[PDB]
Amino acid sequence: NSADSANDGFVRLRGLPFGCTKEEIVQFFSGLEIVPNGITLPVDPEGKITGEAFVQFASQELAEKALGKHKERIGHRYIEVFKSSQEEVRSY
C-alpha cells in the first residue's frame, strides 16, 4: 500500500512530454516485468494532458529497480521517479 507491501510495486513519473503515453513507459521499463496493463496515465501536473503517470510491476522489488533509472527520457522530456502503489496512483 502507497509505496510498499510485497507485490503492489508501483512507480510514479512526473515529467512527461506532449502526447506522452503507455508505450513510452513500456519502453522506459522494457528493462523489467510488469502485470499485463500495469501502467496508469491520469494527467499532467496542470490537468490537460499526460505529464505524470504510474506503473505496477510483478513485485515491489522490480518497482525499485525501476526507481533505479533515476532520469532517462520519454519523447523529448526528462521525467522524475518516486515509489508508489494503486491508491497513490488512481488520480483517475
From Swiss-Prot:
Changing E80A: Decreases affinity for RNA oligonucleotide 100-fold. Expressed ubiquitously. The record marks R14, F18, K48, K71 as: Interaction with RNA. There is a cross-link at K65, K83 (Glycyl lysine isopeptide (Lys-Gly) (interchain with G-Cter in SUMO2)). Residues 77-82 are annotated as: Interaction with RNA. Its main location: nucleus. GO terms for cellular component: catalytic step 2 spliceosome; cytosol; membrane; nucleoplasm; nucleus; plasma membrane; ribonucleoprotein complex; synapse. Changing F54A: Drastically effects folding of RRM2. Sumoylated. Changing R14A: Decreases affinity for RNA oligonucleotide 100-fold. Residues 9-86 form the RRM domain. Changing F18A: Little disruption of binding RNA. Decreases affinity for RNA oligonucleotide 100-fold. Abrogates RNA-binding. Changing F82A: Minimal effect on affinity for RNA oligonucleotide. GO terms for biological process: mRNA splicing, via spliceosome; regulation of RNA splicing; RNA processing. GO terms for molecular function: RNA binding; single-stranded RNA binding. It comes from the Eukaryota. It is found in: Nucleus, Nucleoplasm. Keywords: Acetylation, Isopeptide bond, mRNA processing, mRNA splicing, Nucleus, Phosphoprotein, Repeat, Ribonucleoprotein, RNA-binding, Spliceosome, Ubl conjugation. The modification Phosphoserine is found at S2, S5, S59, S85, S91. The N-terminal RRM domains are responsible for recognizing the G-tract of BCL-X RNA. Identified in the spliceosome C complex. Interacts with AGO1, AGO2, TBP and TXNL4/DIM1. Component of the heterogeneous nuclear ribonucleoprotein (hnRNP) complexes which provide the substrate for the processing events that pre-mRNAs undergo before becoming functional, translatable mRNAs in the cytoplasm. Plays a role in the regulation of alternative splicing events. Binds G-rich sequences in pre-mRNAs and keeps target RNA in an unfolded state. This is Heterogeneous nuclear ribonucleoprotein F. It comes from Homo sapiens (Human). The lineage of its organism: Eukaryota, Metazoa, Chordata, Craniata, Vertebrata. The gene is HNRNPF. The chain holds residues 103 to 194 of 415 of the full protein.
